[PDB]
Amino acid sequence: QEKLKIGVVGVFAIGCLFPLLSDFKRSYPHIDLHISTHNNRVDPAAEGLDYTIRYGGGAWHDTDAQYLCSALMSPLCSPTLASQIQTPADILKFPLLRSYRRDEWALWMQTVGEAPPSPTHNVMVFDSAVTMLEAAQAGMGVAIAPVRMFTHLLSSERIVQPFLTQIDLGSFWITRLQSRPETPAMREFSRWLTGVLH
Amino acid sequence: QEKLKIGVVGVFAIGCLFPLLSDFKRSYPHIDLHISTHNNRVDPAAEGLDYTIRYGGGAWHDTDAQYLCSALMSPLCSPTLASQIQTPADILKFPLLRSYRRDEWALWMQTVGEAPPSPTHNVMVFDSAVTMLEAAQAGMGVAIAPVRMFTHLLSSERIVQPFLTQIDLGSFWITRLQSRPETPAMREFSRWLTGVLH
């Protein structure tokens, strides 16, 4: 077996990669895949990773970065909250849930023609979109995250997307440190993943 | 308003703290609470936190640590997986899901009188118990995590605890850097939380 160690941002692992892993095993049985998750804030050298699947803009320095897929973001909330939401302004009836990035809600609101939320607005901050959406399901507030990573919650009707407008503040990328040697197994995994996504 | 900034381990935020936050607001309306989540691997100084709610043994150096509650761990899996699990050995029909700690499964199995899982066993590693349990619900494998933090999944029947045996590899603690000044709002929040838990 050829070892491959991969650190995957949690939202991507649950929303995309995990369901597809048996297909990787089908195509490449000879690969010993060591999967670990992170919250997008990761040090691949320290963790001894071969690849890192992450969210961002693709321009990490001294990194070989390959595009996986888009991660368009939109408001997401429980059906109970959604019942009280008709216009974008109605989102402000409730606390906002955001990631460590400070601009998500300002940008989305601006795109839909609203003013920025009051600097006084009740806001909760999440290291992980997976945790954010757990809070959202429980009606803790309105989340903003990559819609396609929560198809499972949308289809099962645990979360609703009240508005069509989406924003791009990053995509999903797979990255190798340029100081890290690219192996046969790495090339094969990269080929499989960018391939199965298309 | 008095500002209070708190970084909370995700599993505790979803499984315990979030449901209780309106009760804090009832008792202490004058507090401006800034909640953020982390994956238990956090630097409170860098993040400028007042308090950190975390999982561990209570003996962080140069930290004032206060015990919140126990976090006994047991195997957790989907009903479909559980249907194929009668004895602890049956867990090994499926991949194991673990945290960054390397000893959880060895310890639990040893406690129930089994041998350690093969060093060859399919294992997936999670920065966050919240993400682990999402994977577990989807039948990706059998998780091990703090049972009382997933009452929501147990009650709704999305996850099952097949065995009664639990282990203690850590509890939940609230910690302040000794170099960080203890404020009025901090004392009041600490008092409320240790209080509402009892």
Side-chain angles (χ1 to χ4, degrees), chain A residues 55-56 67 69-76 91 97-99 101-113 143-148 161 163-172:
Chain A
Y55 170 98
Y67 182 92
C69 67
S70 61
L72 300 183
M73 303 200 299
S74 198
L76 292 164
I91 291 175
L97 318 174
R98 75 161 169 93
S99 81
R101 191 163 167 97
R102 289 171 192 268
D103 56 356
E104 298 165 319
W105 279 109
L107 300 165
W108 190 86
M109 286 302 194
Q110 178 186 65
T111 297
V112 300
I144 186 165
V147 168
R148 295 304 286 245
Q161 183 187 349
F163 301 114
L164 286 169
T165 302
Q166 295 167 312
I167 56 180
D168 182 346
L169 309 187
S171 291
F172 289 99

Side-chain angles (χ1 to χ4, degrees), chain A residues 1-24 26-198:
Chain A
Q1 294 285 105
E2 308 188 355
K3 184 174 168 156
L4 180 60
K5 191 185 195 167
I6 299 172
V8 181
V9 63
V11 62
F12 188 86
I14 305 300
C16 178
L17 180 67
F18 283 178
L20 307 175
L21 287 174
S22 68
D23 187 67
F24 174 68
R26 172 186 183 270
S27 299
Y28 302 100
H30 56 287
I31 303 179
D32 217 65
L33 171 59
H34 300 229
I35 284 200
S36 69
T37 70
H38 56 78
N39 65 6
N40 213 53
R41 268 116 50 233
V42 67
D43 186 338
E47 294 204 3
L49 300 174
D50 291 310
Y51 277 139
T52 307
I53 295 174
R54 64 209 307 169
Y55 170 98
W60 300 272
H61 299 296
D62 285 345
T63 296
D64 179 33
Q66 172 143 47
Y67 182 92
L68 302 170
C69 67
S70 61
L72 300 183
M73 303 200 299
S74 198
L76 292 164
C77 63
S78 68
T80 291
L81 264 65
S83 79
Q84 307 161 259
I85 298 167
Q86 288 79 62
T87 68
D90 287 341
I91 291 175
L92 300 177
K93 293 178 183 183
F94 308 103
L96 301 175
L97 318 174
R98 75 161 169 93
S99 81
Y100 275 42
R101 191 163 167 97
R102 289 171 192 268
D103 56 356
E104 298 165 319
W105 279 109
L107 300 165
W108 190 86
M109 286 302 194
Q110 178 186 65
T111 297
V112 300
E114 301 289 333
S118 179
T120 308
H121 208 91
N122 295 329
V123 163
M124 294 173 270
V125 181
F126 294 85
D127 68 307
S128 166
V130 180
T131 302
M132 183 192 290
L133 268 294
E134 286 301 300
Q137 286 172 78
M140 291 301 301
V142 180
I144 186 165
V147 168
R148 295 304 286 245
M149 291 303 133
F150 297 99
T151 295
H152 57 284
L153 307 177
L154 284 161
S155 292
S156 60
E157 285 161 26
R158 292 165 198 183
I159 218 75
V160 167
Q161 183 187 349
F163 301 114
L164 286 169
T165 302
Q166 295 167 312
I167 56 180
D168 182 346
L169 309 187
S171 291
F172 289 99
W173 293 85
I174 187 170
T175 72
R176 171 187 60 88
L177 288 179
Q178 293 177 335
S179 74
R180 182 95 182 188
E182 188 197 69
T183 60
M186 293 164 67
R187 287 186 285 282
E188 283 175 340
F189 180 87
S190 296
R191 198 193 305 133
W192 165 79
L193 180 57
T194 58
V196 68
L197 288 168
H198 177 65

Side-chain angles (χ1 to χ4, degrees), chain B residues 34 45 94 126 163 195:
Chain B
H34 300 229
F94 308 103
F126 294 85
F163 301 114

Side-chain angles (χ1 to χ4, degrees), chain B residues 96-111:
Chain B
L96 301 175
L97 318 174
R98 75 161 169 93
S99 81
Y100 275 42
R101 191 163 167 97
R102 289 171 192 268
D103 56 356
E104 298 165 319
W105 279 109
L107 300 165
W108 190 86
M109 286 302 194
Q110 178 186 65
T111 297

